[PDB]
Structure 1
Amino acid sequence: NICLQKTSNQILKPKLISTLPVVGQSGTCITDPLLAMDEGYFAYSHLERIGSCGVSKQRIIGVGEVLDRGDEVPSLFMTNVWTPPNPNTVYHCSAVYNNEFYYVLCAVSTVGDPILNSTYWSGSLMMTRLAVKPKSNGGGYNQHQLALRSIEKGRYDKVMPYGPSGIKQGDTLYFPAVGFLVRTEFKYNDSNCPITKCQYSKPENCRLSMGIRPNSHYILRSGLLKYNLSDGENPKVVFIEISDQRLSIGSPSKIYDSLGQPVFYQASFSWDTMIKFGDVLTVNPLVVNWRNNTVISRPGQSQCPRFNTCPEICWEGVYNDAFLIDRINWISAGVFLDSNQTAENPVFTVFKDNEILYRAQLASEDTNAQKTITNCFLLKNKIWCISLVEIYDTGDNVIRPKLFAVKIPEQCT
């Protein structure tokens, strides 16, 4: 039982918790965060850059346990850390937990960020497996690279992990992903671009905004990468595209279990800026029963600001996910930047489709903030959420992820 009523009472008490100590050291910038959680365990990643935010010094990928720290508040206890040999080659990591291991799928690139340099990326992927409870002298039990024998990608030129975390269904893992499709092969009817109440929107705007520029070589299509652990000695990776219902440019996404059923979140990196999430009807093919949410959006720039609904040509926005905490009433929780066109003012928010119930400001109105990743769970039968929030210090000119733990209150006063 949680508070189901709208209230201005400050019933949310966010607690500042803390994975690694380097996150705090002066002289290093911490970027490209990942946080994933399942079954009492977590996976975490960041890129460390000496000085500017840059020149990569170290990629860390670690796993551990989520535990009560001593005073009934959960925190993260790191258990097993891996450092890739060249931090300049590893991009877009994504984590799924299964049967005592976390599996982490990343892109390997000798040509930079594959999203920004798509035409030259080889499409190379790597899969690393990390024991959540390692063994002293555990060799290939503690950390192990898995051989990817084959990547099934259909009509797509390349496919890639794209989002912090996914789900397992038995022996099969599903990572959030994106497919690179040659723009000339994209099948789209401009009549489907919804411009009826949008006098300035051209019919072609949906189609042109399916890539990061209107004249891009590729369009981006979100979906899943399926990895079945029982599928022979070296399982294949299979791309599953998201359906064309409420289609938005392929963007960082998340699939997660909540209350026994999966939910899918897709970041709004274009003109469709109201929150894109909902229960998954089928995983393969991927169909999402998108919420008709009228209260949660995200900051952008001039053409696609917060609350924008009209088709425009734009590639802008921020990843601020939401986690379902009550299916019977469809109530969710996340951290959203309360601003129209600047990445500012992170607020922990509990909300329904057409109603914000209650909230708590995490910093100040002028606090610059960016990516937010929220996961909720039970601790002694009380609903807790942990949110990673990138806080940008404009004075210091440095981004650092902060971790907050918030108990969802039972009462409204």
Structure 2
Amino acid sequence: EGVSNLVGLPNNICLQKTSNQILKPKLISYTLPVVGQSGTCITDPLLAMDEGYFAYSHLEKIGSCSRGVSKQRIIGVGEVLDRGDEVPSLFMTNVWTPSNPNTVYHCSAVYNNEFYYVLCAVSVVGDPILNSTYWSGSLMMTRLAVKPKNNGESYNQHQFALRNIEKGKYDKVMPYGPSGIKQGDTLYFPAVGFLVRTEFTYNDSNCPIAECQYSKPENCRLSMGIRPNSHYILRSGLLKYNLSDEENSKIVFIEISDQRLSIGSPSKIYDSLGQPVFYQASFSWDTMIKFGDVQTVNPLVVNWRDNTVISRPGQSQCPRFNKCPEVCWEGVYNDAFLIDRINWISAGVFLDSNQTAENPVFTVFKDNEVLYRAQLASEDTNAQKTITNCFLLKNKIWCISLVEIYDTGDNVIRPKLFAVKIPEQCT
């Protein structure tokens, strides 16, 4: 008995499309009363899970939830055990908070032997994805153990800043994503690359504007950056960190392939059922979900899954279900964790809206059809970012998903974590 990841052979799960709601959403984020209300706001979440250990990060803003200030950034790890009879939850054991809250942005977590590295970005100009034209480029990786001891001083918290970067053609690197993977003694972190627009090599004739009359050909080139007249085009990739040497911090940014090349978005790679599975958000011309498995670990090449039923909403410019090139940098992060490989069954909390961001619904889809859905809230509660992770509880698959919802008696976007169990028996 034990809380492990997707390994071996789990129990048989539902393989048919049923309207009968057989999903049981269970809340494990019971908060205390918020007597003494104010302009609080919780954003920038993070949820990683591996071998029974989790992590969390958040930036509490007092005022507006976007253009606010920084007061505290609680970054902590813990263990994953059960509440009662077949009720798993997340038990936090260690908590770390930086001195100055308005320095840390865009963290990335990873698992290790008996530690939990948190690779964050350091900036003195604010949001690096908004003022990258003056960002230095320094990166900081915080190591937090999942089991502290008495009077260690070197075993509980490890504030480490990296020195060398192997940037070949990119001008700057930054950890961009919830979590990565590892192979023995080689940590990988999701990231995005900063490359000059005038130094981009992309012929403007491979753009899918053939069956897109209401789309200009240069929309592919104009969509690779945050703005048309910008100075940097984002590029997805991964950061390599070989901790088996410890002689010099190495930062190697391995860029992604050219197949369905989109703008930089929060990516998430995880080892599901042995093979590494990669995810990439859609903040570009492509509005559908970017899913697939990885065959070459170090040379990242992801076989994209052509799902036509799972997408994300947006603004009027680029709404949901849009498959033509358009200049637009918008969307919402909604990932999914792989629960089966023989049938390629995925599971994640995806929003169901055309041009709005409400009604967070957990949906299960194999490749081109939804099997069974279940609403985690009402059809009016807003939601921006969702993080989905699945594991096992001693005989069966369990999934915990962090979904920022709008609580009634809190008046603040609260990252409520819902614990959902993959149904073995269905109608």
Q: Is 1:285 aligned with 2:299?
A: yes
Q: Per-residue CA shift, 1:307-330, capped at 9, x if unaligned? A: 110000000000000111001100
Counterparts of 1:318 and 1:23, CA distance in 2: 31
Partner of 1:167, secondary structure, is coil
Q: TM-score, normalised by structure 1?
A: 0.97
Q: How many angstroms does 1:233 deviate by?
A: 2.2
Q: How many angstroms does 1:26 deviate by?
A: 5.7
CA contact 1:147–1:234 (8 Å) conserved in 2: no
CA contact 1:368–1:393 (8 Å) conserved in 2: no
**Cα gap change, 1:301/1:255 in structure 2, threshold over 3 Å: closer, same or farther?**
same
Q: Per-residue CA shift, 1:182-235, capped at 9, x if unaligned? A: 111011111111111111111110111001101110000010011111134233
Q: How many angstroms does 1:335 deviate by?
A: 0.3
Counterparts of 2:351 and 2:198, CA distance in 1: 36
**Cα gap change, 1:111/1:22 in structure 2, threshold over 3 Å: closer, same or farther?**
farther
**Cα gap change, 1:20/1:74 in structure 2, threshold over 3 Å: closer, same or farther?**
farther
Counterparts of 1:317 and 1:62, CA distance in 2: 28
Counterparts of 1:23 and 1:353, CA distance in 2: 46
Q: Per-residue CA shift, 1:50-80, capped at 9, x if unaligned? A: 3432121101110001111113111111111
Q: Per-residue CA shift, 1:245-286, capped at 9, x if unaligned? A: 011101111011100111111000112011001101212221
Q: Which residue of 1 aligns with 2:63?
A: 51
**Cα gap change, 1:79/1:395 in structure 2, threshold over 3 Å: closer, same or farther?**
closer
Q: How many angstroms does 1:21 deviate by?
A: 9.6
Q: How many angstroms does 1:391 deviate by?
A: 1.3
Moved more, 234-243 or 326-335: 234-243
Q: Which residue of 2 aligns with 1:77?
A: 91
The root-mean-square deviation of aligned C-alpha atoms, in Å, is 1.8
CA contact 2:139–2:161 (8 Å) conserved in 1: no
**Cα gap change, 1:391/1:24 in structure 2, threshold over 3 Å: closer, same or farther?**
farther
Partner of 2:332, secondary structure, is coil
Moved more, 396-405 or 356-365: 396-405
Q: Which residue of 1 aligns with 2:101?
A: 87
**Cα gap change, 1:339/1:24 in structure 2, threshold over 3 Å: closer, same or farther?**
farther
**Cα gap change, 1:90/1:176 in structure 2, threshold over 3 Å: closer, same or farther?**
same
**Equivalent position to 2:16, from 5, 15, 19:** 5
Identity, % of aligned positions? 95
Counterparts of 1:321 and 1:206, CA distance in 2: 24
Q: Is 1:198 aligned with 2:212?
A: yes
CA contact 2:34–2:410 (8 Å) conserved in 1: no
For structure 2, list consecutive stretches of 5 or more residues without a partner in the other structure: 1-11
Q: How many angstroms does 1:147 deviate by?
A: 4.0
Q: How many angstroms does 1:15 deviate by?
A: 0.4
**Cα gap change, 1:306/1:23 in structure 2, threshold over 3 Å: closer, same or farther?**
farther
Q: How many angstroms does 1:362 deviate by?
A: 0.7
Counterparts of 1:232 and 1:70, CA distance in 2: 42
**Between structures 1 and 2, the one with greater strand share:** 1
Partner of 2:270, secondary structure, is strand
Counterparts of 2:33 and 2:55, CA distance in 1: 16
Q: How many angstroms does 1:27 deviate by?
A: 5.0
Q: Which residue of 2 aligns with 1:26?
A: 38
